[PDB]
Structures are given as C-alpha cells and as structure tokens.
Amino acid sequence: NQYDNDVTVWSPQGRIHQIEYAMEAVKQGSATVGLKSKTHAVLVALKRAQSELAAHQKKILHVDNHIGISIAGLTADARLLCNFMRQECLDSRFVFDRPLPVSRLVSLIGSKTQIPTQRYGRRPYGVGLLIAGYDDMGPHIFQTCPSANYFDCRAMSIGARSQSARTYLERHMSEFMECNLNELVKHGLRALRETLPAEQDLTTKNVSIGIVGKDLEFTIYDDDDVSPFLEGLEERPQ
Amino acid sequence: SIMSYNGGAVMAMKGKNCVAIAADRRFGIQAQMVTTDFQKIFPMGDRLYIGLAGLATDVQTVAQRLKFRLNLYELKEGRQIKPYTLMSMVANLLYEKRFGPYYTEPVIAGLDPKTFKPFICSLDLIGCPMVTDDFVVSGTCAEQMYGMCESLWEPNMDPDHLFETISQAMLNAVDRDAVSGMGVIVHIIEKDKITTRTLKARMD
C-alpha cells in the first residue's frame, strides 16, 4: 500500500506496482487480434458500444502506408502514441525517402514509453498496441505494453477475455504461414469471436478489420465492407 | 559627434577649504537653442555636487540613476557619502554600459563630510576616474577651458578668488564655443555655506 502510488518506488519484492496497475488498463478495453501469413498482416478488432444509440469505438488506426495499429486501453494515450508513430514515420520518409522499418518504429515506441516509468510525477502509458506492418523483411505483428516492453509475434491477442483468442491462435500458428488473405482474416475472426459468450457473435456493426501486405497498403474495413469477410464463416459451437 | 549634439560645459576647481563647480545653462539641439535654464549640476548630498556634460538625455538619466543608488547607499549605511566613494559609484555605473555607454563626462566636486578636505575628479563615458588638485573640465569646449585654467588657477585660493577664477575661466572659454553658453552658473561650496550665482554672460 506504501509502494502503490509512485512509478519511482520499487517494492521490497523487486516490483513496480504503478507499472502493473498500468498493465491492468489494457484488460479494461475490448479484445483485439493480430496475425500474419507470409504476405499479409491482419488486425481484427472487436469494437465496443456504450448503449445501442452510440456508435462503436474506433479500435484500428492508420499510421503509415505500410503500418497500422490496434489499440487496447486509454484512448487518449492511444492517440498520443499513434501521433508519435505517425510523426516518426513521416520523419523517416522526409529524411530517407523510404518507409520506416517496423521493428525500428517499435524500438522507438519502447524507448519513448520507458522514460516516464523512471521519473517522479510521471506515469506509464495506459495502452497496449498491436502493430501490423509490411517491409522488406515481410509482414510483422508487434505488441507493445505499458511496461514499455515489446514483442515480435506470429500471432497475438490483448484485452478483455483475450485468453480465449490466445488459446485459439496457439493451435493454428502452423496454419497461419501459408493461408491466403481470406483464410487469415477468417482465423483472426474466429480467434476474436472466441472471446464472446455463445449468446452473442460477430456483426458488421461491431467488427473492424485492418489489412496490410505486399499487394496492399494498410486499409480499414468498418461496416458494409466487413461483410465479405464475415459471410463465409462457420456457425460456431456452443 | 554625439557629444556635440547638445553641447555644454562643466568645470570644477579646488580652493583652500572650499571647492567650486560651474556649468553653462544652454539646452540646444545641434544649432538651435531650446532652453536657457537647463540644469547640469546636481547635489548628491550636502557639500557634494556632480556636474554632467554631454548628451542631455544621458545627463539626466545618469543623474537620476546615480541619485537612486546614492539614496539606497545612504539608507543601507547610516552616513553621508564620501567623495571618493561617490566617484567609484559613478565609475561603476558608467562602466556597466562599457559597450553601450552613456554619452556624458561627469565631474565631481565636493568636501569630505567628515573632514572638509576639498575634492575634484572627472570621469570617462565608460567611467575612468581622474582626481586632481587644481581643476577638471568636461565639455565641447574642453580645450578652451584647459587654456583658461592652466593660466588662471592658483593653489590656496579663498572663496572669493576661487569664484572669480572659475567664473572668468568658464565665461571666456564658453565665449569661444558656439554650442556652449547662454549663461553660466557657479556653485562655490564651503564648510559653513553654499553660494550659488548666475553670471552676467553673452546670450548669442
């Protein structure tokens, strides 16, 4: 209780409680899935709604022509980090006239987000990110945490009840690398839908898709443009 | 020249146990006279006067800031200021603007408030002090004033001979300069009293 309120205070057990509390912010948001084939990187996000009269929250954001993200946590921090990534990409294009390698952008995210976890009066970024990108090393799915740690993934899921999605993806990793785009998005949608009780399922009103690849810039499908993906899926079990 | 813009003349002379300080009264802009009663001599306390010649603005400004620092000095310390001390004060004040100097050449004349020992000095525009035992001059007609002072000044002058000497020096120097004159004022200061006179002078 005395080691809870500052990010500059180590616990006697070698832990920083503010960082972990910040990590808990990711689980507060709606779940999201990211997976890559060998040609495409795909983000599938479950949009959440307050009431039935409120539109669904944006979960997928455009960063650069070759990079997009899916957020999970505080939308303000998400917008901040997003603008940062956008700025870094623009800088890279301005200086070198070539798109910024995704891994380097992720490294910069790590460096930036690490700073406030070591200064008094500062706080960690209350947001988790799934980054889908394509460069001359192929497609990439990355994950960034409030603890400023980042991971290079074959597949990943973060947020509320994302454990189900994780469990699903962990079985189909081997399938992922050879799937075509439609099958990849399918797998993503199944993983995403696993994080739901049987009384509810995916809809064109509550599902967003972000796709980037060797033949496609990062694009966001939101409403009627999602139907070609949903229509072509199993009935799921109970 | 910037100094010659307003013109003017300031002189100080030493006496027995008295001291003298004089200055012309013309405030003019280049060739036109605006005022005939312009003050160029300011009292920095009892029996201690300063006289500034040069650019009128800097005359007034240096006088005012000097009075500022002086008042603060005589408040912080429970005493009147010594002549040497005032000189160093002015020197510091002027040198603070070493690379953007006030265009005025101050001349200090007074008596030691503790003793009575006469004191005259002059300074640069950047505040280099110069103490003398006879006379000090500053102004557009410095050469004329030097000419008169080098030939009129005697050592131990009484408060009456000192007056006549500094008056003749000022009058006759100023009368050979076009931008100095329109009246001369003389302060002859001694331990007991201060006598202020304005001389009969040319007004052309």
């Binding site: - | 000497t165 003749q168 009293k193 006598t195 202020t196």
Partner: protein, 220 residues
C-alpha cells in the same frame, strides 16, 4: 603610455609614465599606471584606461579570494592565466595591454599580455605607444642578472625614451621594485618634466566678475 618591465638578479623592476590623453590633448599629467594585483605582484597598464583599471582590479580581487582560500602567496602564472583567459574571452574588445611582474615561491616572473589574450614570458618587455623606444633602450643596454639600482636605471631610462620620443607619453616616471623580500613602490621616481613658471599675474580681483543672481545657503 609607455610601460616597461625587467628581470634582474633579485627580482623585477616595473616602469611607467604618467600621461593620460583624450584626443591629442593631455587629460591627466599624473596618472598611476602601475597597479596592485597582490602584495607580491604588480601590473602596468596601457591602452584603454578604464579597461586596464577594471581588469587589473578584478584580477586583483580574484587573486585575493584565491590566496585567502589557499593561505599561500599568489603565483604570477595564476594572474597571467586569469588575465589572458578573460581578455581572450572578449576577443580584444577590452583595450588592455599589460606588463605583469611579480616574485613567487618559484622566483621572479615577467609577462607581457596583449588585449587579444596572448602572453609572452620574457626577461624584459615593453608596451604602449612608446614601447618601441623603450625596447630600443632595453635591446641596447640590457644584461642578465643586473643589480637593483642598475635595473632601476635601465627601466627609468627606457620610460624616459618613451616620454621624450613619443607624443603619447609624458610627465613623470613611476617605478616598482619587487624582490624576494621587499616592495619599493617608488611613486614619482623622477620628475624630468616641469611646467614653466608663470611670468605674469592674471589674478582677477574680487568684483571683476559681474553677477546677475546670488543665493547663500547655510549648512552645518
């Protein structure tokens, strides 16, 4: 001005004239150009008067602080470093040519310091508008390890050359002798120039000056 400095067997002799000019007119007939730095270090100043004054004063002050903290007698190299570094930081905008002389725990030391911040450690140096004449006297009549009076004679001779040959120099000759255990700050070491005596009486008798206004004010 016309300042010089020499190093002899027991210490250092510093010389300077006393003429200060503004324009081509003598403003000060008796100006002290040999400045106190530390009780064992003195410095002659030539160039912009106020600059030499404030610079020498500042360095003197800093050296007083220095020795106050160290408890020892100040070294000449220290004054030299302070001076040259300050002067160099201002890139010559401080018109201060200097002759720095003093006796240390390491012996006698003489430096010349130019306003741009360069220094020269030499057995004899000259600075000022009359420095060439003085340097001629030095180059003609200097020998290593001179006796005190001999060196005083040499330096005063140099300053004299500056005085009579340079229109920028004039009036008295000031000396400063500094040995391992003596400090002779001889003010008017020589008055080789005298004003001619007045041949007339131009004294104005009381009343010859007409007055328009009078006001007496009593003091205390």
């Amino acid at each position: 001005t016309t300042i010089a400095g020499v190093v002899y067997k027991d210490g250092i002799v510093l010389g300077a004239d006393t003429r200060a000019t503004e324009g081509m007119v003598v403003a000060d007939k008796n100006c002290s150009k040999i400045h106190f730095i530390s009780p064992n270090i003195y410095c002659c100043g030539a160039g912009t008067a106020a600059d030499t004054d404030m610079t020498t004063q500042l360095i003197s002050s800093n050296l007083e602080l220095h020795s106050l903290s160290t408890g020892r007698l100040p070294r000449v190299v220290t004054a030299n470093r302070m001076l040259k570094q300050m002067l160099f930081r201002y890139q010559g905008y401080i018109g201060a040519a200097l002759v720095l002389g003093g006796v240390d725990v390491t012996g006698p030391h003489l430096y010349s310091i130019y306003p741009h911040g360069s220094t020269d450690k030499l057995p004899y140096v000259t600075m000022g508008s009359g420095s060439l004449a003085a340097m001629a006297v030095f180059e003609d009549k200097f020998r290593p390890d001179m006796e005190e009076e001999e060196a005083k004679n040499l330096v005063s001779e140099a300053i004299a050359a500056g005085i009579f040959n340079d229109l920028g120099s004039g009036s008295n000759i000031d000396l400063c002798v500094i040995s391992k255990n003596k400090l002779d700050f001889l003010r008017p070491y020589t008055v080789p120039n005298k004003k001619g005596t007045r041949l007339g009486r131009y004294r104005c008798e009381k009343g010859t000056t007409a007055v328009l206004t009078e006001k007496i004010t009593p003091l205390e």
